[PDB]
Design a protein around this ligand. Structure first.
Ligand SMILES: [Ca+2]
Ligand SMILES: [Ca+2]
Ligand SMILES: [Ca+2]
Lengths: 172, 173
């Protein structure tokens, strides 16, 4: 009687619920794709602004080193010899992957210097299951430390979200 | 005599940097607005699907209780007495403000129980237009997890983004 109908309804309702979650999964995937496309679009928009900013910074001889040193979290990470190398740092760069979700890289651009041969040291973060893999430029030291960073990465997030976003508020 | 002593080109480079940062600020705000618009669009689209999910759930006894009690993180947060209480949970409900940005609330609907008076225990997260946000909650009217209802959030994130989003995966296990 009523018990059989409730029983049958219960079996049916579990299946319909699996259908509803499948619908919700596809809706959540469309929405997070759409949020991602907005961020991809605005990385396009910001790119020439970051370029102009890099151009202006060429006129301020120790800008990036100075902003990095004035940042409360980052500044105390430069041992005194690190700061002599940082004298040759002339540009920092952060770029998301084209699709955003799959990572980004951080690059320290170095002028010609006696410590190492590289013009740039890059640390890359790839991740697309929650996990992430890191790669870094193996430093081509010359014959004659914060630089251990080039091998849960809080220095990366500070650089990416604070210093890279507005280094001027630490420079000022 | 601060900027007067400084080389003109250094002075003007800072001014131009400040102006570029202002441009970047405006760009970031157009990006926020555009993302907010996407969240609002899909809040509307999901609403009748959540309603249909709530309707179907009425035919499954103890659904929300079983999903909460089977969640690996959330389950690890009940006392044995907290589990005596949750046997009386009939419904979970997460609702964002009509604009997404204002915040959201999480509501636990309990049936008549011997532990407290309330039928709804609600924890509302209000995002203020100026910085810090205001967190309100229900004062339990008793006749631990329920320490979560303090106006002072890992639990709220797990509920909003995990349990509420797909409870059926924890009903099965
Ligand atoms: Ca369908
Ligand atoms: Ca679209
Ligand atoms: Ca002077």
């Amino acid at each position: 009687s009523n018990l059989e109908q409730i029983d049958a309804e219960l079996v049916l309702s579990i299946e319909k619920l699996q259908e509803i979650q499948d619908d919700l999964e596809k809706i959540n995937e469309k929405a997070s794709d759409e949020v991602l496309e907005v961020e991809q679009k605005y990385n396009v928009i910001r790119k020439p602004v970051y370029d102009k900013r890099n151009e202006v910074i060429q006129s301020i001889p120790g800008f990036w080193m100075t902003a990095f040193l004035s940042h409360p979290a980052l500044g105390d990470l430069l041992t005194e010899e690190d700061q002599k190398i940082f004298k040759y740092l002339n540009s920092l760069e952060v770029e998301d992957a084209k699709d955003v979700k799959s990572g980004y890289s951080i690059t320290f651009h170095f002028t010609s210097n006696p410590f190492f041969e590289d013009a740039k040291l890059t640390k890359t973060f790839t991740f697309l299951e929650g996990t992430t893999k890191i790669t870094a430029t193996p430093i081509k030291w010359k014959e004659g430390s914060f630089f251990t960073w080039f091998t849960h990465d809080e220095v990366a997030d500070i650089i990416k979200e604070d210093l890279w976003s507005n280094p001027l508020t630490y420079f000022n």
